[PDB]
Design a protein around this ligand. Structure first.
Ligand code: NAP
Ligand code: NAP
Ligand code: NAP
Ligand code: NAP
Ligand code: JUO
Ligand code: JUO
Ligand code: JUO
Ligand code: JUO
Lengths: 250, 251, 251, 251
């Protein structure tokens, strides 16, 4: 039977590309989304056209709250309900915006930034593991620039740092169950919609390898390697896919 | 007049030794505490016996919730209220317990406690500290030398301490233009947990290359003192391991 | 026309597994060796029996000396002589033995071998590789996942593997504009030393969270093949651990 | 009895400041120099003027060669000859210049010998000699906060500073049972190279978050003083950045 993967925030951009590549590799997919219903459904329909009954969607807010553990259990459960199994979890969904130290309240910002980037991945990991020639693994989308952060992104950066912790802690704890846990750490990949080209170019010009951002597919390629049979000894590793950006001094 | 410092979880163990050593150095101190009211009040008495009106206690839960920001604001406000200034913040308070991934508090409570005390409260305290501001302003965060070689089944804790590294770095960057330095001190094995059995304590002691023993609370405090001092005025974003070489030892 | 690769120390163990996998992927290969001539020739024979004129051997000492630069130039030149191009360089050859700080070979010989093979020869091979240059050019350095948790009394070996991390990063930066990617693969416990008895092997195996066993040579080679592939064309300056979680395990 | 310290490359700049502060703290000092004899003697004269027979000079090239081990043994021996003891070793001497990988005075192997010898091999040999000849004993290695974000075309220098991180960590582990602590101080931008253009100096200064200026030599020395002190007696294998946040600033 075909293996199955959950990809969070999979309606657009990197998560979409990850879902597509997994599908092309032979996985059935749960496309998790928050607000982007039309795009999630569009993707599911495209994937099911290619092969019937191989893609479903699952809506959830991954903001931290009292109901987050249940929402996370329900995402994993939907993979088991659709496909009978859950082999791969990709923690991709992420809130990203500034929170300077000096209309959303700060606790709402905490909930969203820390919930999406850290707590939801932890809860999803718990639910994934509890539900367990297998090749089980988790891939967390990290940040190559986590030790050279953008100015005034404290909470975002804290979330991504916590995600490195999770990757390492879960790699250690789940290794006896045969579940590998790794990361992929983009530098500059797809830039924000509507960011002016002139500002995109300030970031692009910093990248040693080609003075361009990573495509979503280039990020997805590293995810594919990590879930593959060619990575069966690899756990707790975080692979930068950054064109050398992180090596560049100020 | 004398500078002033806030130390969180300062009623006992490492936080107490930090508060003591700051006070010996010249600081007026806010002794924050959660449950350890008797020990906090007793420390404030000891320090005030040495120099009157140089210590106050301040009670707060640093578990994450919708009122955590107000609580953190109030800790900083309590230093200004007692002393008219706030020069140093030491983020020492910390929950520490296992949260296994695979099968009596709820998981949401565990998240709130472990992530709140180790990460969110230091963030909010840092915000309130900066907002309220010769001078030598700085923050010291109590980190963990074993953050990349964590205890088995401590994912939430480890996540909190990793986030604390991120905060230390991010706040060092953002607050540098205001002359506020932000650094860390990362113990390996120091005062063993009260609940840990004697055999397990001896197991941990035996892992430490430099002396086969735990760091004293005073040894940790010595590093905090250095970082807040005039001898550390160009140091920001640095995390100093005080671990006797423990983090260097392979499995 | 098929691309071509140089693998240093390729007569056996991990270097052989890398050359075999590259050859299976469609590369022509230069099998560098130092003392292991029989094994090297035996490998070239096997690969050439599979596809004619696709493997050659190349002998060189990679100990540091005043002629090491000429030796490294000649290794690269051997790939151009055989195959008319050189797309991939794998720096695998390595001396590995203790050098106690307190107490056969003179210390300067130990420096020349340990630092030469692990760091200086990779540097010179990298210079020659770059100087001699649809296309997918890259270099892969065999690093060590335990570089920050080293074996006791292996100072010079550890210094050499640390230098190799530096080269990997420096070379990635400097050669990015030429389209040459520079990455590493960092084993933890893979094939154990021939001189190690089974009991000592089992002590190391038991340390590994993922399966309590060493990485196969093929498992190491798999990570090399990825980094040289089209699937890694935005990856440069990255060191991939292939260690089964070993580096995450505390003392 | 006053403790004694060896400081390599102590005639000028950061090494001079380290020698001065150690001396001011109560140490007797060996001022090592290569080319700067006039300056080394001028320093010694100044220090002996404060306290008679507390400063001596010691000449040596620290370029790697057949004779480097003997030269390093004699640097340590000079401290025991002058003062009867050797408590502290500061590995400060360093060659620093570019070594491009791609080319359009020195042979590349001479560059290897200077850059890797001064920054890594001489520190290793001085460490062996220091430990062999053996209280608050420690070693401090001058590292580089930008070791993972290196200057373009400085591969060999960077390899040497990476190897020094390895030595710091390896020696911390191996010498801990002897009570010898081994730590590092990692500047970012401190005293700018004398041959750097003034416009290039201001470009580096403007990058620094904490004050948009370089560290003074004394602010670097302050961190050395902490690490050798009784306030750091549980600290080994630690590298303290003194970089004003520079290493945290993205491209
Ligand atoms: N792009 C880059 O350059 C870059 C750089 C470094 C790291 N990364 C990381 O790589 C991953 C993918 O990057 P990306 O740029 O493609 O991400 P993105 O577009 O910023 O976010 C991906 C998705 O996250 C979901 N999300 C946001 N808030 C959510 C919430 N409260 N609950 C549930 N889902 C939520 C959204 O789903 P809906 O649209 O359905 O609402 C969104 O489409 C992220 O983890 C990101 O942090 C990206
Ligand atoms: N001891 C070690 O070996 C070691 C190792 C690595 C890192 N560290 C770090 O160094 C610091 C000091 O360690 P330690 O062992 O002295 O700490 P500890 O005794 O575990 O905790 C210090 C204090 O934190 C406070 N605290 C706990 N939960 C709290 C909450 N919800 N709200 C407010 N305060 C709370 C407690 O105050 P009350 O008693 O008043 O309730 C406690 O006394 C901690 O950050 C720790 O993680 C220690
Ligand atoms: N095995 C592991 O568990 C492990 C762990 C961490 C890192 N690594 C790294 O991964 C790589 C492969 O490991 P391995 O165990 O397969 O290596 P290895 O067997 O120890 O050495 C591979 C080859 O290095 C060559 N070599 C040694 N000294 C040389 C010299 N002076 N000049 C030229 N070549 C020389 C030898 O060639 P001849 O036989 O032709 O003389 C040898 O066959 C190495 O870089 C190693 O440091 C391995
Ligand atoms: N300045 C900075 O911004 C900075 C930044 C990062 C790291 N660092 C590190 O901090 C330390 C001090 O920096 P600095 O700028 O003061 O150093 P420096 O002036 O570049 O060098 C200090 C001394 O090294 C000695 N030296 C050079 N080559 C030598 C050789 N072949 N044999 C013996 N001695 C030799 C010289 O002694 P003579 O003059 O007697 O010949 C020189 O005066 C160095 O380790 C450096 O790498 C400095
Ligand atoms: N868009 C988007 C991001 C989603 N997660 C990100 N994380 C970082 N560290 N940077 C980001 N960007 C702003 C700097 S340039 C690369 C894009 C993003
Ligand atoms: N008490 C306490 C701790 C507070 N934060 C800690 N962090 C770690 N990684 N270990 C700890 N300990 C368990 C190992 S032995 C020393 C104590 C503690
Ligand atoms: N053989 C071999 C090694 C080549 N480079 C190595 N580097 C380390 N840190 N360990 C190694 N080993 C000793 C620990 S068990 C696996 C082998 C080797
Ligand atoms: N002098 C001197 C240096 C000795 N080691 C150095 N390492 C780095 N990474 N930068 C340096 N400088 C050039 C950049 S500006 C600060 C000085 C030096």
């Amino acid at each position: 039977e075909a293996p199955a993967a959950v990809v969070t925030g999979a309606a657009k951009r990197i998560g979409r590309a990850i879902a597509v590549k997994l599908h092309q590799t032979g996985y059935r997919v749960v496309i998790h989304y928050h607000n982007s219903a039309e795009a999630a459904v569009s993707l599911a329909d495209e994937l099911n056209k290619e092969r019937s009954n191989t893609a479903v969607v699952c809506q959830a807010d991954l903001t931290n709250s009292n109901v987050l553990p249940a929402s996370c259990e329900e995402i994993i459960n939907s993979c088991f309900r659709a496909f009978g199994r859950c082999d791969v979890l990709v923690n991709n969904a992420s809130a990203f915006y500034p929170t300077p130290l000096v209309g959303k309240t700060v606790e709402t910002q905490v909930a969203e930034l820390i919930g999406t980037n850290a707590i939801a991945p932890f809860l999803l990991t718990m639910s994934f593991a509890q539900r367990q020639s297998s090749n089980l693994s988790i891939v967390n989308l990290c940040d190559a620039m986590v030790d050279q952060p953008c100015m005034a992104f404290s909470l975002y950066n804290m979330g991504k740092h916590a995600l490195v912790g999770l990757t390492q802690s879960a790699a250690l704890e789940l290794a006896p169950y045969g579940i590998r846990v790794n990361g992929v750490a983009p530098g500059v990949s797809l830039l924000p919609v509507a960011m002016g080209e002139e500002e995109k170019d300030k970031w692009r010009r910093k990248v040693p390898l080609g003075r361009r951002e990573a495509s979503a597919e280039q990020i997805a390629d590293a995810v594919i390697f990590l879930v593959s049979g060619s990575a069966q000894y690899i756990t707790g590793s975080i692979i930068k896919v950054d064109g050398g950006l992180s090596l560049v001094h100020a």
